[PDB]
Amino acid sequence: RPGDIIQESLDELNVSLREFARAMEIAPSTASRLLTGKAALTPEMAIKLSVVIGSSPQMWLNLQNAWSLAEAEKTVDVSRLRRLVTQ
C-alpha cells in the first residue's frame, strides 16, 4: 500500500517516475519496485521520501508496518500465545 500513497502524491505533483527516481537519487527500476510494492520501504527510503515528497520518515515507515502487520497478523498463531505472568 505504501507505494500507492507515494504514487498518489506524485500524481498530485504531476511528477513522473523518472523525475521521482532522480530526486530520490535512486535508479528507475528501484523507484518502480518501490511504487509497486515489490520492494519494502526501508528506513533510508523513508528518510529520502520525507525530504523529497514530504511528511515524516515515521509516517512512511508506519504505512509499511501497517501493511506488514496486517498481513502477518493472520499468519501468526496468536490463538495459542499467552501473556507472561510475573514469576
Contact residues for Mg ion (CB under 5 A)? 26-27, 30
Q: How far is the CB of 38 from Mg ion (least distance, A)?
A: 13
> Nearest CA to 6 among 44, 43, 55?
55
Distances in Å between the Cα of 8 and the Cα atoms of 22, 74, 83 are 18, 28, 41
Q: Identify the DSSP state of 55.
A: S
Residue with smaller CB distance to Mg ion, 30 or 62? 30
Tell me whether residue 4 or residue 44 sits nearer to Mg ion (CB atom).
Answer: 44
By beta-carbon proximity to Mg ion, the closer residue of 18 and 76 is: 18
**Distance in Å, CB of 48 to Mg ion, minimum:** 10
